Amino acid sequence: SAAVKEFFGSSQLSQFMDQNNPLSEITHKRRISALGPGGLTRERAGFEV
Amino acid sequence: GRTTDPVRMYMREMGTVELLTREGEIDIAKRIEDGINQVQCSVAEYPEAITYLLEQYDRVENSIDPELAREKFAELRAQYVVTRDTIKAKGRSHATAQEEILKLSEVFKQFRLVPKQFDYLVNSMRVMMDRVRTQERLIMKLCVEQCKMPKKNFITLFTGNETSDTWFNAAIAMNKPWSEKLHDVSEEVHRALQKLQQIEEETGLTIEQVKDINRRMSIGEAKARRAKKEMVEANLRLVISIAKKYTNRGLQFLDLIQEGNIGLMKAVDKFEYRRGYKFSTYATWWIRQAITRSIADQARTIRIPVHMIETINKLNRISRQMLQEMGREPTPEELAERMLMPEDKIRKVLKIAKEPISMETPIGDDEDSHLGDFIEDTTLELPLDSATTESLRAATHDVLAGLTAREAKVLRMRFGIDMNTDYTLEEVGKQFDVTRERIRQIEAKALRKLRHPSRSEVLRSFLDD
Amino acid sequence: SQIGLFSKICRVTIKTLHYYNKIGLLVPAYINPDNGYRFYTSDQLMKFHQIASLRQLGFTITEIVTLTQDENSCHIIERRRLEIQKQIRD
Amino acid sequence: TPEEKLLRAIFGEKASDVKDSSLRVPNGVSGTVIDVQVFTRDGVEKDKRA
DNA sequence: GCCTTGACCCTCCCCTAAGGGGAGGGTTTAGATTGTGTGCAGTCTGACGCGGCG
DNA sequence: CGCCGCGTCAGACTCGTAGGAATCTAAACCCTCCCCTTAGGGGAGGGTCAAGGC
Numbered sequence: 001s002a003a004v005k006e007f008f009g010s011s012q013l014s015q016f017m018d019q020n021n022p023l024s025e026i027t028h029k030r031r032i033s034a035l036g037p038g039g040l041t042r043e044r045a046g047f048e049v
Numbered sequence: 050g051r052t053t054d055p056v057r058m059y060m061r062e063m064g065t066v067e068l069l070t071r072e073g074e075i076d077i078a079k080r081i082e083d084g085i086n087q088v089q090c091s092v093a094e095y096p097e098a099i100t101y102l103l104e105q106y107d108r109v110e111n112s113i114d115p116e117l118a119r120e121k122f123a124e125l126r127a128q129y130v131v132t133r134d135t136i137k138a139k140g141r142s143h144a145t146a147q148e149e150i151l152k153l154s155e156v157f158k159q160f161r162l163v164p165k166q167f168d169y170l171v172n173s174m175r176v177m178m179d180r181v182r183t184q185e186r187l188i189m190k191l192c193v194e195q196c197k198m199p200k201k202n203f204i205t206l207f208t209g210n211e212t213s214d215t216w217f218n219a220a221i222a223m224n225k226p227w228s229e230k231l232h233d234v235s236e237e238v239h240r241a242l243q244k245l246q247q248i249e250e251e252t253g254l255t256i257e258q259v260k261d262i263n264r265r266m267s268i269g270e271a272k273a274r275r276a277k278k279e280m281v282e283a284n285l286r287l288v289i290s291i292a293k294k295y296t297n298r299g300l301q302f303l304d305l306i307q308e309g310n311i312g313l314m315k316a317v318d319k320f321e322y323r324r325g326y327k328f329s330t331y332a333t334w335w336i337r338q339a340i341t342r343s344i345a346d347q348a349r350t351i352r353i354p355v356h357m358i359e360t361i362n363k364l365n366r367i368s369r370q371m372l373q374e375m376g377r378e379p380t381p382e383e384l385a386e387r388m389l390m391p392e393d394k395i396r397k398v399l400k401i402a403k404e405p406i407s408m409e410t411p412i413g414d415d416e417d418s419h420l421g422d423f424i425e426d427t428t429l430e431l432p433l434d435s436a437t438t439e440s441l442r443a444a445t446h447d448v449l450a451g452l453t454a455r456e457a458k459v460l461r462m463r464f465g466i467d468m469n470t471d472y473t474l475e476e477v478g479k480q481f482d483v484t485r486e487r488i489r490q491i492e493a494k495a496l497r498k499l500r501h502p503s504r505s506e507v508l509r510s511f512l513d514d
Numbered sequence: 515s516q517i518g519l520f521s522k523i524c525r526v527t528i529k530t531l532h533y534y535n536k537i538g539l540l541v542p543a544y545i546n547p548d549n550g551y552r553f554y555t556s557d558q559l560m561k562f563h564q565i566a567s568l569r570q571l572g573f574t575i576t577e578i579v580t581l582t583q584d585e586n587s588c589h590i591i592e593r594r595r596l597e598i599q600k601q602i603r604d
Numbered sequence: 605t606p607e608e609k610l611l612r613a614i615f616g617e618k619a620s621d622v623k624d625s626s627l628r629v630p631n632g633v634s635g636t637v638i639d640v641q642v643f644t645r646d647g648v649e650k651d652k653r654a
Numbered sequence: 655g656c657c658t659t660g661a662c663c664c665t666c667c668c669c670t671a672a673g674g675g676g677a678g679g680g681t682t683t684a685g686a687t688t689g690t691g692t693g694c695a696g697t698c699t700g701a702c703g704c705g706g707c708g
Numbered sequence: 709c710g711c712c713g714c715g716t717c718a719g720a721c722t723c724g725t726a727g728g729a730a731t732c733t734a735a736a737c738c739c740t741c742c743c744c745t746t747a748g749g750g751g752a753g754g755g756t757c758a759a760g761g762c
């Protein structure tokens with residue numbers, strides 16, 4: 001239970017929803033990220049990626 | 050050595066020892082036991098300046114018959130009172146004395162491990178032996194300042210003769226001018242040597258037999274120590290195999306190991322091989338006890354007592370099984386009904402099990418904003434309040450000038466304004482030699498005038514608080 | 515015998531034995547010098563029986579003390595017989 | 605403070621045992637109340653509004 | 655006005671008899687058991703300075 | 709002497725929001741100190757209420 005609820009509540013990919021519009025939510029549910037656990041860091045990504 | 054880790058540096062220096070077999074630990078324990086009794090032997094024939102058991106059996110005065118507890122102490126002293134009658138014959142080192150006092154040792158060997166009782170008898174000479182030592186240091190810090198002299202003739206014949214100062218006649222014999230270059234100070238040498246000779250009076254025995262058999266008494270106290278050391282050093286893998294089941298509970302690995310070793314050093318001191326059990330079976334208890342006691346005393350920022358630790362653990366154990374059984378988490382009512390405690394105590398316990406958060410906890414999307422940035426100082430006074438305090442002080446100082454000077458001094462003394470302390474009626478009338486009651490009269494005068502509406506509405510402005 | 519077993523031989527609480535030791539009414543046989551434990555013997559039970567026997571007549575602790583250690587002092591008993599004879603009437 | 609003690613002696617007023625911790629509207633905001641919700645603990649007296 | 659009596663009054667702390675309840679601290683416990691372990695983190699590029707080996 | 713390996717240091721500014729913070733087993737026995745229990749007593753220290761003497 002601890003391992004599951006820590007992922008669903010304090011991860012970096014688990015985000016507070018954006019709810020201004022219908023389009024704001026549609027867009028937030030289709031986003032693709034390269035950050036996170038097992039991905040890049042903002043300071044250490046280059047020009048080519 | 051191509052490594053800086055201290056856990057590997059430990060596990061490497063620990064592997065150069067061999068594990069013992071069932072006979073090895075028995076014949077190590079045997080010599081541990083017989084050295085500590087060789088010492089107790091050596092203590093036997095020391096003079097009455099020791100705290101010898103004449104009435105220790107009476108000092109105290111498995112449930113043994115009282116007639117058994119009173120009688121078998123009469124064997125040893127029944128022989129001892131007639132044995133050491135020969136303390137006079139042929140000096141102090143007579144052979145009948147050695148024979149029958151080691152027969153008292155034949156008697157002494159019966160006993161085995163005991164509390165510090167035995168300790169407090171050998172301490173009987175500690176407080177007396179090093180004394181002797183330090184006193185012959187005094188003489189030396191009284192000789193080297195005045196004259197220089199080769200130590201290995203002087204202190205050698207000092208060790209040897211100990212009859213009288215006649216050995217100083219062995220200093221002039223080589224005919225060099227350092228013989229009597231000393232002047233007017235040798236009576237200080239005689240001072241300290243004479244005081245240790247009255248120490249010899251109270252002991253009645255010369256030093257070179259006491260220190261002689263202390264040389265062999267020190268053999269037992271070291272031969273037990275060495276065997277204890279190699280009984281400890283052969284069992285460290287036991288500590289390391291036990292202490293690996295206490296990880297991730299507030300202490301680090303090497304802390305748990307160094308806590309277990311202090312318990313193993315006690316299991317080695319309390320062992321008894323005669324009872325027939327192995328060493329592991331007795332040592333595991335003390336090892337686990339030391340590790341468990343150190344987890345509950347350290348490893349929390351705010352420390353909880355041991356009884357509260359056991360209450361917390363019991364409540365955790367109950368809620369686990371109620372959660373497995375019901376499929377939910379039980380409310381404090383369902384825990385109070387089974388734990389059989391008043392519900393307010395169950396509510397009180399549930400607050401004490403939280404560890405403080407770090408002030409470096411990242412709060413936001415970034416990691417440059419921390420929890421400790423938004424924490425406000427609460428003990429500061431607002432500047433509107435400072436200005437109000439000063440304005441009120443000025444207003445009071447102005448209203449206190451209208452009425453009489455002597456009639457305002459009493460208000461200043463009565464409420465403590467502009468003074469280091471508040472005062473009482475009798476100690477104010479001390480300087481006025483006015484009665485207990487007239488002070489109250491003039492105070493009801495002043496406080497009656499000061500609320501007349503010609504004066505009040507300057508001070509009334511402040512009381513809207 | 516330790517205090518916990520002696521408390522079951524006599525069927526009395528431990529706080530009662532502590533109190534009786536403090537007052538000076540029932541003193542243990544032997545007290546450990548470093549621990550401070552209390553050990554009792556059979557004559558302690560023979561005396562506790564007398565204490566309870568005296569306590570069943572309504573006496574307070576000071577008169578029970580004065581009755582056990584000191585002389586017979588018969589004037590205290592009949593003097594009690596009035597305080598009961600009066601009390602019933604009340 | 606001594607001065608405030610003398611003020612209480614003259615005008616006779618006394619303070620009391622409780623302090624005001626009420627909930628207020630933040631400055632600049634002006635609105636209409638449209639909903640209220642009350643959550644009370646099991647073992648506590650429910651009130652008129654709840 | 656400027657002081658002296660003799661009454662009255664209040665609050666705060668400690669006390670009664672025979673234990674009860676709890677908080678916080680000490681100690682030992684004898685069948686045998688003898689070398690960690692995370693299903694780790696390892697993950698950027700450029701300039702500069704010094705030691706270790708040919 | 710020269711090359712290479714390896715270890716240390718650096719990488720723009722000011723604003724916004726966003727609830728809570730994540731595993732983890734000892735048990736029996738002893739001791740001392742502190743407050744609690746009925747229905748009022750007792751004192752210490754510090755205040756107040758009429759009445760006159762002058």
Ligand code: 118
Pocket residue numbers: 333334337338341733734735
């Ligand atoms: C889990 C694992 C071991 C013990 Sb234990 C013990 C506990 C109660 C009754 C008897 C034994 C233990 C001993 C000292 C300190 C702490 C715990 C225990 C000891 C030796 C061998 C096996 C178990 C407790 C829980």
